[PDB]
Design a binder for this molecule. Structure first.
Ligand SMILES: CC(=O)N[C@@H]1[C@@H](O)[C@H](O[C@@H]2O[C@H](CO)[C@@H](O)[C@H](O)[C@H]2NC(C)=O)[C@@H](CO[C@@H]2O[C@@H](C)[C@@H](O)[C@@H](O)[C@@H]2O)O[C@H]1O
Ligand SMILES: CC(=O)N[C@@H]1[C@@H](O)[C@H](O[C@@H]2O[C@H](CO)[C@@H](O)[C@H](O)[C@H]2NC(C)=O)[C@@H](CO[C@@H]2O[C@@H](C)[C@@H](O)[C@@H](O)[C@@H]2O)O[C@H]1O
Ligand SMILES: CC(=O)N[C@@H]1[C@@H](O)[C@H](O[C@@H]2O[C@H](CO)[C@@H](O)[C@H](O)[C@H]2NC(C)=O)[C@@H](CO[C@@H]2O[C@@H](C)[C@@H](O)[C@@H](O)[C@@H]2O)O[C@H]1O
Lengths: 40, 40, 40
């Protein structure tokens, strides 16, 4: 079931974003690959 | 063009995150595959 | 290392979401491909 994201972070060493989820004991995350770059 | 996200959810059954968008009739979403897992 | 997201936007022309990061000079983003579609 869809559950809300309580905090979103991203990481330019791992090239992943991690979404902390509201569910159960509070220790579930969603995580996906991303590009990370400097604008301008 | 980039539009704001009003709410972000993720789902450990479908392995998707869904971003509700502020645009048009209010019923547009962005969605992507994700990993979902327990930590700790 | 993980850094906070300050703003999340998504774009139905590019089919990407972009996360502005709290890091460094403030001009780093994470960006990933997404589906974008109308619901209901
Ligand atoms: C002089 C200095 O410290 N420059 C920093 C860059 O080194 C750093 O870019 C990463 O550098 C490592 C090598 O140390 C590479 O393996 C990565 O591929 C580089 N990442 C990117 C996206 O270019 C940048 C960026 O820092 C990274 O991304 C941030 C958003 C954050 O997650 C940091 O923790 C992460 O290291 O920062 C310069 O200051
Ligand atoms: C006893 C009990 O209820 N255990 C729950 C797990 O079943 C559940 O893990 C999912 O289980 C289904 C089969 O029922 C699998 O098809 C999924 O692959 C499992 N998902 C994961 C990520 O392991 C877990 C996790 O719940 C899921 O993810 C949450 C973040 C949330 O989105 C839930 O709605 C979703 O079902 O929870 C245990 O309690
Ligand atoms: C009459 C009108 O303006 N209709 C709009 C649609 O054209 C638009 O759908 C995009 O249309 C372009 C060509 O104009 C296509 O290349 C895209 O593939 C279409 N995208 C999608 C997702 O269908 C829709 C949706 O607008 C897009 O997505 C929004 C979330 C936002 O990012 C917009 O800036 C973006 O154009 O909107 C209709 O109103």
């Amino acid at each position: 079931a869809p559950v809300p994201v309580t905090k979103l972070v991203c990481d330019g060493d791992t090239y992943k974003c991690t979404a902390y989820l509201d569910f159960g004991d509070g220790r579930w995350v969603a995580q996906w690959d991303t590009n990370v770059f400097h604008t301008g």
